[PDB]
Amino acid sequence: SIHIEAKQGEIADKILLPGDPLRAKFIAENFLEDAVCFNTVRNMFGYTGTYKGHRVSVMGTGMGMPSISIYARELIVDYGVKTLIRVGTAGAINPDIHVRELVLAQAAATNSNIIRNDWPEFDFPQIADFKLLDKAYHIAKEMDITTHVGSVLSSDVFYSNQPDRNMALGKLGVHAIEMEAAALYYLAAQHNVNALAMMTISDNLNNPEEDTSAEERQTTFTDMMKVGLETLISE
C-alpha cells in the first residue's frame, strides 16, 4: 500500500518479481491461468492467477535496489507474502558463462550502501533462501538447463564509471551483474521470509559479439519461467 493499490486477498502469498511490468503482464497471460490485475499504480502491473492449481502472483519491480525495496517491503509487510522469486536478466562477467545460460544467486554482492549503512561494522552477505535455491537447482538440472550457482553483483550504476573493477569480480566466483537481488535478499532476511533471484544471461560482457535469436530468447525465457514457477509452488 501507498505504492500498491491492491485490497487484501488480491495478492497470493508467493510472487514472481520481474523488473519489467510488461514482463509480468506477459507471464500472467501465458504461464498463469485466470490471471487478473491487482495494481496499476505508477504503471507497475501486478497479476494474480493460478499455476497447477496454486494461487500465484507476479508483478514488476522497476529497476534498482531502492525500487524493488519499496515493492518487496509492501508485499511482505502489508500483504503477507512469504515466498518471493526474482526472475530477470543479467550480464555475464565470468568468462565461463555464456549468453542464455541460467544463473541462480546463492548470494548477491553489491556496491550499494543500503546494507552497509545499517551494518557499518560488517561485510554482511545477502543470501538466497537455501531450500529455494536447492529446489531451483534440482528442477533446472532435470530439464537439462545449463545452470550456474554463485554470486551476482547487484549494482547501483548500469552505466558504470569503473567497468574493469566489476569485470575483475568475475574471476572470483561472481557470475553476472544485475540491479536488484541484494535488496530483495536483505528484506527477506529482515522480515524472515524466503527469497531467491534467478536470471538468464542476455549479454556476455566478456564477449560482446555473442548474439541471441529472439525465438531462442523465448525458449530460454520459457525454460526459466518453469524453473521459477515450479520452485515457487514447491512445499
CATH number, domain of 33, equals 3.40.50.1580
Query: What is the domain range of residue 94?
Result: 1-235
Nearest to 140 by CA among 4, 231, 23: 231
Q: Which residues are catalytic?
A: 203
* CA-to-CA dists, residue 127 to 1, 52, 108, 154, angstroms: 26, 28, 6, 12
Run of H or E residues at 223: helix 215-233
Strand 194-204 and strand 102-110: pairing?
antiparallel
Q: Which long-range contacts (CB under 8 A, 24 or more apart) does 217-226 make?
A: 217/100, 220/100, 223/102, 223/143, 223/145, 224/87, 224/102, 224/145, 224/198, 224/199, 224/200, 225/27, 225/31, 225/87, 226/139, 226/143
Separation CA 146–CA 101 (nearest Å):
6
Resolution (A): 2.4
User: With the CA atoms of 25, 71, 181 and 105 taken in that order, what torsion angle do they form, in degrees rounded to the nearest 10?
Assistant: -60
All three cell numbers of 223, joined, read: 525454460
Strand 102-110 and strand 126-127: pairing?
antiparallel
Residue 204 sits at the vertex; the CA angle it makes with 201 and 206, to the nearest 5 degrees, is 145
Residue 68 sits at the vertex; the CA angle it makes with 150 and 171, to the nearest 5 degrees, is 25
* CA-to-CA dists, residue 123 to 116, 119, 219, angstroms: 7, 8, 38
CB-based burial of residue 152 (10 Å sphere; 0-12 exposed, 13-18 middle, 19+ buried)? buried
All three cell numbers of 53, joined, read: 492449481
Count of structural domains within the chain:
1
Q: In this structure, what are the phi and psi dihedrals at residue 78, rounded to the nearest 5 degrees?
A: -95, -20
DSSP-derived 3-state class of residue 195 = strand
Which residues, including other chains, have CB under 8 Å from residue 30's CB and lie 6 or more apart? none
Tell me, what DSSP letter sits at residue 7? P
Separation CA 7–CA 129 (nearest Å):
28
Nearest to 152 by CA among 112, 208, 188: 112
Task: Note whether 201 and 103 are within 8 A (CB).
Answer: yes
Tell me, what DSSP letter sits at residue 198? E
Determination approach: X-ray
Alpha helices in 103-214 (DSSP H): 114-118, 130-142, 163-169, 181-190
